[PDB]
């Protein structure tokens, strides 16, 4: 999320939760294999459907309702 150091010298940052068996997008440095980095974590369609309480199928976000 964010990481840095204060003028005093003390280090601050975050440790976002890490999960096994999750799908992660990867971008190689200079398009070299054997140079991986994780960009973000994307869940499955079922998992996303389970963890949302929105009953609307669709509709423009600008509608009041």
Q: How many residues bind a second copy (CB under 8 A)?
A: 36
| Sign of the C-alpha dihedral computed for residues 53, 56, 61 and 64 taken in this order | negative
- Going by C-alpha positions, the residue among 29, 3, 32 that lies closest to residue 16 is 3
Q: What is the DSSP letter of 45?
A: H
Residue selected from 29, 39, 50, 51 as contacting other proteins according to rule CB under 8 A = 29
3-state DSSP call for residue 16? coil
Q: How far is the CB of 23 from a second copy (least distance, A)?
A: 9
| Nearest to other proteins of 38, 42 (CB atom) | 42
- Residues between 35 and 64 that touch other proteins (CB under 8 A): 35-36, 42, 44-45, 56-60, 63
């Amino acid at each position: 999320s964010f990481i840095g150091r204060t003028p005093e010298g003390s280090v601050f940052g975050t440790k976002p939760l890490i999960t096994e068996g999750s799908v992660v997008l990867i971008g190689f440095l200079n398009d070299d294999i054997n140079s991986p980095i994780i960009l973000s974590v994307y869940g499955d369609n079922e998992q996303n459907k389970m963890i949302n309480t929105n009953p609307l199928d669709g509709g423009k976000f600008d509608t009041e309702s």
